[PDB]
C-alpha cells in the first residue's frame, strides 16, 4: 500500500489568508476554503496561534474541523512567492457540511508545486512540433502559427474545415468565464458548425427529451432528497459519483434523521424514513450502502437487463395511470391537454431524426406508452412483483390519501443508455403524472457529472441533429482541429478506430512540418496546408497536462485551471459560487478564456495582414485582461438574473453562494430560486409541460443488437470512486495509481474460472469496434455474463470497444456494449500488492 | 529537530494474540486507538516468526469513526461512509473516502516476544503531528 | 531563481548504514558514501548521536565533512522500506578529497523517491504499443513480443537485419556488468555487425590513432597532473567537464602547492609551478580559472581556428625535433626504427579507409609531418610567436639540461574535431618524442567523458571500418532496432534527417500494430514483420526514462541504474571501484545485464519453439540472477588480472579502489598498476610504439569545407557544467531547468547587435543538414563569427545542424559545424528570470 | 514544530546603505555571515522604496569559502572554485559548483526604515538547520 510517510503538517496560523473554493471536480460542488500563509511562517498548537482556536496538542474527535489530511496540504506559488496552502472542506457549507470526498480532499496535493514536486507534468510553455519533436516556444510564436494555418484553411475552404472539440462544462476545465470565452470565439466571431462537446461527438443536449417536454433538468434542490418519501435513482452510482449529495442529503432521509424536518415543512401528511428504488443492472456500493442504512426492506434494487429502462418506466406509467395514482389537478392545470396525432412512421421512428419521440397529453401518452407488467417483466428480466412494488413506492397514496412525494434522479446509466430521448421522456412522464416537479420532496433531475457553467452565444447554426464530428474526422474530413480540455483518445466512443485515423492524419502534417523550414513561417504554413489538402489534419490542443490526443497534436497551449484563476459555476442544485484564486498558473500558463481572447486577437492581426479586413473585424470584443472581464461580458450580460451577480457580491456569499437564477440583490445578498416550476408554468411557449408518447422499440442504436448477439459479455462501464475522469491528474498521484495501475474489469468469479482467468490477470476485451486491456477484478456481486470496466483510463481505454452507435440526435450509447475477453498476461508483478477484496462495507 | 521523534513502546507480547482476533492497543499515546492483529499468513509490515503480526490505527482517516473488523473478510470497515481497508495488504483502502491508506505501525518483536511500535507510516486522524 | 525552501535536513545518525558510491556521472569517478537509515529515525546534534562525532548545533567551517546540501538528501526504497539517504562526497578519496561537483552532489535529489516525489518520470513497467497508445504490461509479455519479432526477422533476413545501438561506457548506464551482458548477447550468442555505440554511429574506437601506435589512451595517473612542468590540454574544458580532476589535481600544480611533493619525488631537477597550454578555439571558464590561479603569464591559450589542431601539432613536432628537444634514448629503445614506404595515395589518403595515417619511425614521421611555423600560423590563425612559445613550454630542457615533464591531455575538441586519426597521432608524436609516457609528470591521455567499464566478447566480426548504422537506418535498411541507454534524437549527428526518417519507418510498424489484434500474438508478430518487409522498423528501447527516440519505439523495457544495483567501473586513472547498492530499482525495473540475460533466455525459448534448436543453443550462458553473476562471468574471467578481483575485495578497498590492471591480491589488498608503460614496452607485437606520419590535409570530412564556406557562423558545441549529458535526469530537476530552460547559444555581443538579437531571444540555427533552436546568451569572450551551442539538449538539439560527415573510420566530426542564425521569437517570458552575466569568476 | 522558527532580526536601517556597497550582517545568528545590498533597480526579493534592497548569505553553498563582491558586475564571486552568483536575479548561480542558488533573506522594512530578516529560502552552508 502507498503511504506518504508524512508524520506532521504545518499548522494553519490565525492570520492565514482565507479563500472561498468550490471543489474542482464533481457536480455536488462541495464547499472548501484555501488558507495560505508565508513559507517561513507557521501556526502553533495554542488556540490563539491557529485558525481554529483549538488546542492542537490534543487528539481531536471524529468529524473535527481542526484537522486535515496530508492530501489537503501543499506549497504553491502565490503572487510570485511560495506559500503554504491548506484546502479543507467547509463545515458551514450546506452542500457538504464539511464532508470532502476522496477526490476533493486531494485538491491541494494535485496542485502544481515546484517546492514539493507535485504535478510536475503540468504544462508551462506553448509547444510546437518542429525540428523533429515538440519544442517549447513563446505565446506570440505559437498563436501566430495557429492563427495563420486556421485563417488560411478557413479562407480557402470555409469555416466548415475548422473542427472544434471543447468542454461545455463547469468547474475546473470549464466555467462561465471559459465557456463564454470559447463560445464567443467559435459562435460569435465565427459560425463553427463542426463542433463537439467533451463527452459526446456532436453539439447536442444530453437531455433533449426533458427539455422539449418543458422540464429543465435541474429543477429541484438538494433538500428535496431529504424530504422525499421515495427516491427513484436511475443509472446513478451516487455514492461513487455524486458522493457528498448522497452522504449529506440522501442518507439522512434513509436513516430517518430528516423526519423532524419533513414534519415541520409538511405537517398535514404522514412521514416515514425514505425508501429508495435503484434502477441499475449492476449491484453497486450505492445499493449496499442504502441497505445498510435504510434496511433491505426499504431498498428496491431493480437489476434490469442493460438498456431496458424504457420498458420499465412505460410499465410503471401504465400501472400508475390505470390505478389513478396521479395528480389530476397538476395534469389539468399544468400539462398539455389536447393531444396531437402520431407522426406517420410511429411507433418505430418519429417525424424526423430531430424528434425521436412524440410529445402529447397525458392520456395520449399513457396509451402510446402502454405496456403491461408481464411484457415489461419479460424485457427487463425483472419479476412482475418487483415492478408492481415499484409502482406502489412511487404512486400509491399515503394514509389519508395524501400524494406520495418522489424525487426522481437519473444520470449516465440512462443518458448514455438505450434510446436516450424516449427513455428520458418516459421517466419524466412519471414525475409529471405524480405532480413531483416544483414541489418539496420532488424533482425529475439529472444528478449530474461535472458542475455546470455554460454561457455562450446562440448555437442555432449547428443544427439538430448536429454534425457527428468524430465521423467527419474518421472519414478524412476537416482541416484544422482545436481541442480544448478533453481527450478523445481516452474517452470518445469507437476510440480505437478514432485513434488509428487521427494518428495517420496528424502524421501527414507532422512529416510535412519536419521537412519544411520553420524560421521561414510562410513556407511552414504552406507545407502544412498542402498536407491538409492531401487529407491531413493540423491539430491544436489547449490543456493543463500532456494529453493522449496531445501526442498527435502540432501545437500545445498551456492552460491555467480553477484556483490558479477565479472561476464561477453552479452545482446540481443550481448553487452558483465563485472560487477565488489562491495560487499562480504554472509557468506561462493562461486561463482558457484568455487563451481564446489571445487567439481572437491574433486572428484579427493575421487576417488584417492577409487583407481580409472584414473577416478580421469579426474577432473584436476580446480585450479581456483578466477572467473577470469574461465573466462580465458573458454571464453578467447574458444569464437570466445576470445583472445581480458580480465577483464582489458572489464572494460575500461564500461557499453557500445562491441558487440560480438570481431574482434580485438586497442587503448584500443575491436572491435566488430554490426550485423551478413552483407555479407550474413550464419551459414551453404556452407554459404547459408535455408528456411523451414513447413506446419501447428495442435497442435503438445501430449495430447494438448484433453486438449483443455476437459477443459473450456485457462490458458495462463507468466510474470508480477513487478516480477522477480520465485520470489526467490522477496519473501523477501515487495514492490513486498504487490502487489501480490498470483499469479494473469487475468480473463474476465463476465467469473468471470459466475463462481461465485469475485475479489481477491482464485481459484483452475485444469486439467489432476494437480491443483494449484491463485487469480482472473478481466481483462476487456481478451477475454472470456481465462485467464492468472503469472508463477513460490511460492504462487501458474502455472506449476502444464501444461502437460508433448513437441515437438519432447523436447521443453516444456507451453503456450498451458487448465483447469477448481473453488473457494477455498472467497477473503482473506490479499488481501483486493490490487488494482484490470486496468494495462493499460489512457491518 | 527535523523529524518527529517516535517513542518505542511495548504494546503486548506475542503470547497474548490469537489468530485473527484484534487486540486493542494505542500508539503513540493513549489517545490514538489501534490494534495488533495476527493474520496467519506473511504480509506487508508483518512481524513475528510467521511475519503475520500487523498493527494499525483503527480510527478512520476520512472523518474519524471507529473501524470495525470483519473476521470473515479480514477487513476493517467504516460505519461513517462505508470505507473498507485491507490489513493483509498494508491497510490499502479497498474502497473509501479517505485519501490515505490505514496508518500502520512499524513493529519490532524483542528477543522475549515483546512487541514494540516505533513509528507510523501515515498521519493519524485528528492530530497534525503523530507525536503530540 | 530556483530555491528549494528546505530549511533543515534530517541528521545522519551514528548507526546509519554506509555504502561506497562512485559518482554516477563523469570520468573523474569522485568517491561518495551513501548513508541510509530508517524513515522513523534520525540523528541529533550531540556527537554521540550523529555519524560525524561532531556537535552539529555549531556552525561548521569551510570544507567541513559535517555538512551536506539539500541535493544530497532524499528518501528512497531499500529492501521494500522507505529509508532516509544521504549521498555525500568522501573526504578520504584521493580522486576528489571531498569535492562534489554540481552534478555528483545531486545524485540523491535525482534518485527516484515516491515519498518526496523526485524523478517521477522514471520507468517502472514494460510498455508496448497496442490499442492506439503505449500500454503497460508484464515482463513476460514484453519480452516474448521482442524475442518473437527479433527471432523471426533474423531467421528470415539474417543477423544483419538486427540493428543495435548501445552504451559502451562505465558508470550509470554502463559498467562492467552491463557491457558484458549486452556484449555477450550481441557478440557471443550472436555476431551482430550493425551495431553502434551511444556517441558514434559505428562500432569503432574513438582513438584508433593512439591505439594503433601502441599507446592505450589511459596510461597515466591523476598525480601526474600535479607533477608536470607543463600541462597541454587539447580540446578539453576541464573545469566544466572533468571538474574535480581539474580542481583537485591540476589546480594545485598551477598554484605551486605541489612543489614540495615535486621536489620530494623528483629531486635532481628544478621545479616551478606548472604552466598550462590550452588548445581550444574558445575561451572557456577553464582558461579563466587557469589565469586566475597561475597568473596569465603561465597560461598560454592557443585559440586556434576550429579544426586546425593537426597543423599546430605538426609544426610543434617539427620545431621540437629540429631543435633536438627529444628524449633520444626513449626513441631509440622504445619506438619503431623500421624504415618504411608511404602508401601510394599519400599524403591525401592512407593505404585504405581502415588506415587513414601512416605509422613510422621518429625520423620518417618528422619528415612526413614537416610543417613550418609560418605555414601553421597561416592555417591556425595563431601568431608565429605563440607556436614557438608552445614548443618551448613543451620541449625546452630545464636548468640542468633536464627533460621537461609534460602531461598531454585531450578530449572531444580533438576526438570530435578534424581528421581524428591524424590529429590523435600528431599529438601522440609530441609525447613520444619527448619521452613523456610511463614516467611521472607525463602521459598522453584522454581526459575522458563517462567512466569506463568495458568487457565484451570479440568484436572482430564488425570490421574496420565498421558499418555506418545511422546511414543504414536513414537509407531504409534493417528490420529491428534494439536501443540501450542512448538517445539519438538528442545526441547523434545529422539528427534532423535521422528523426524524420526514423519517425516514418517506426510509424509504419505502429500503424500495423494498431490495426492488428494483440491477443492473437501470432497475428500481431506477422503484421509487424510484414510492415518491416515494406520498409518499416520495429524499435525496442531499454532505458530508465521516457526518451525522445522512445517516442518512436514499440516496446520499452525499464532499467535499474547505478545505486539500485551494484556496479563496477574505472575512472580516467583506471581506478576501479565498486558502487554498492543502496536502494531498490523503481517499480519492476531491472539492471541492464539482467534484461540482456532475460532476453537471451526468451530468445532461446522462442527459437526452440520455432524449431531452430542449434541457433537457440547459442543463447545459453545467461542464467544470471544478480548483477554480480555478470561481473563474474565477464570481468573476472576476461579482464587482465580479473581473477584478483571480486565484489568482496573491491568493497574492502573503499572509494579508493585500485588501479587496473590488478597484478595480485595480498593482505586484503588488490594490488594494481599506477602508470602504464613504465618499462617502455608498448601495446604492439614488437613492444615498440610507432610515430605517425600524419600530414595536414585540410578539413577531412566530406562536405565540411563547403559547409564552412557557405554559412555565416561557427556552431561550436559541447557541454555546460550544470547540465549532465542529454538532461535525461536534469529535465525533471528544477535547479538545472530554472537555469537553462532552452539550450544556450553563446554569441559575441556585436554579432548579436549585427543580427538584431538580444539576450534571451529564441533563435533558429539552420544549414544544409537541418535546423534547430536555442536561446542567445551574450558572451563577451566569444570571437566574432564563433558561437557555441549546448549539445544534447531536449528543448533545442544541436545535432540537428551537424552534417552526416565522418572520417574514414566513421568518427563523427561534431565540432566542425557551421550554420546561419535567425530570430524565431523575442525573448520568451520563461527566460525573464535568467542571469545573462559572464560565467567567468572575477577576482 | 513542523517548520523552522525564524527570528525576526533587525539588521540595519535603510539610511545605513549606500548604493552598490554591501553592508556586512549576520542572519539568522552571528555565525551566519551575509550582506545587505542596495542595487538601484527593482529586483527579486528586493525591498525598500525602490524594491532594490536584498540580503544574501555570503558563504559559498559549495564548500563555504567567503564570497567577494564585484561592484562592476554586481556579482558574488567564490575564490574557492570559481562560482558566480547574481544578486540582481535572486542569487542565481550564473556558473558554479553549488547545487543551490545563493540563500536569500526574506526582508521587511518597518515604518522607521529599519530592515528586518524573517527567513531564508535555501539551506545556509555549514548548518543542517538554518536556526541552530
Ligand atoms: N468518482 C467519480 N465521480 C464522478 C466522475 C468521476 O470521474 N469519478 N465523473 C463525473 C461525471 S463527468 C459524470 S457524467 C457522473 C456520472 O455519474 P453516473 O452516471 O452515476 O456514473 P457511471 O458510473 O457512468 O454510471 C452509473 C450507473 O449506470 C449503470 N448502468 C449501466 N447500464 C445501464 C442501463 O442500461 N440502465 C441503467 N439504469 N443503469 C445502467 C452502471 O451500472 C452504473 O453503476 O459522475 C461524475 N462523478
Ligand atoms: N558538466 C558536464 N561534464 C561532462 C559531461 C556533461 O555532459 N556535462 N559529459 C561528459 C562526456 S560524455 C564527455 S565525452 C566529456 C567531454 O569533455 P570535453 O571534450 O572537455 O567537453 P566539450 O564541451 O565537448 O568540448 C571541449 C572543448 O572542445 C573545444 N573545441 C571545439 N572545436 C575544437 C577544435 O577544433 N579543436 C579544439 N582543440 N578544441 C575544440 C570547445 O570549444 C570546448 O571548449 O565531458 C564529460 N563531462
Ligand atoms: S469516517 Fe470513515 S468513511 Fe468517512
Author numbering:
A (entry chain E), C (entry chain A): 2 to 844
B (entry chain F), D (entry chain B): 44 to 175
What does the published report state?
Arsenite oxidase (Aio) is an ancient bioenergetic enzyme present in microbes since the early stages of life on Earth, with its origin dated prior to the evolutionary split of Archaea and Bacteria. Aio belongs to the dimethyl sulfoxide reductase family of molybdopterin (Moco)-dependent enzymes, with the Mo atom coordinated by two molybdopterin guanine dinucleotides (MGD). The large subunit, AioA, contains the catalytic Moco and one [3Fe-4S] cluster, while the smaller subunit, AioB, harbors a Rieske [2Fe-2S] cluster. The enzyme catalyzes the 2-electron oxidation of AsIII as well as of SbIII, albeit with pronounced differences in reaction kinetics: SbIII salts are oxidized around 6500 times slower than the corresponding AsIII salt.
In these structures, the Mo atom is cis coordinated to two oxygen atoms (O1 and Ox), shared with As/Sb. The Mo-O single bond distances are ∼2 Å (varying 1.77–2.29 Å in the four molecules of the asymmetric unit). In both structures, the As/Sb atoms are sitting vertically to the Mo dithiolene plane, at ∼3.1 Å for the As–Aio complex and ∼3.3 Å for the Sb–Aio complex and equidistant to the two pterins: the four dithiolene sulfur atoms are at 4.5 to 4.8 Å from As and 4.6 to 5.2 Å from Sb. The bond lengths within the As/Sb oxyanions (As/Sb to O1, Ox, O2, O3, and O4) are very similar in the four molecules. The crystal structure of a polyoxometalate containing μ-oxo–bridged Sb and Mo (CSD YORPUS) shows a similar geometry and bond distances as the intermediate structure (NT-26 Aio-Sb_d) now reported. Interestingly, a structure with two symmetrical μ-oxo bridges (H) such as observed in the X-ray structures (D) (NT-26 Aio-Sb_d and Af Aio-As_d) is readily obtained from intermediate C′ with a barrier of 11 kcal/mol. The Aio enzymatic mechanism relies on the formation of two symmetrical μ-oxo bridges, present in the oxidation of As(III) as well as of Sb(III).
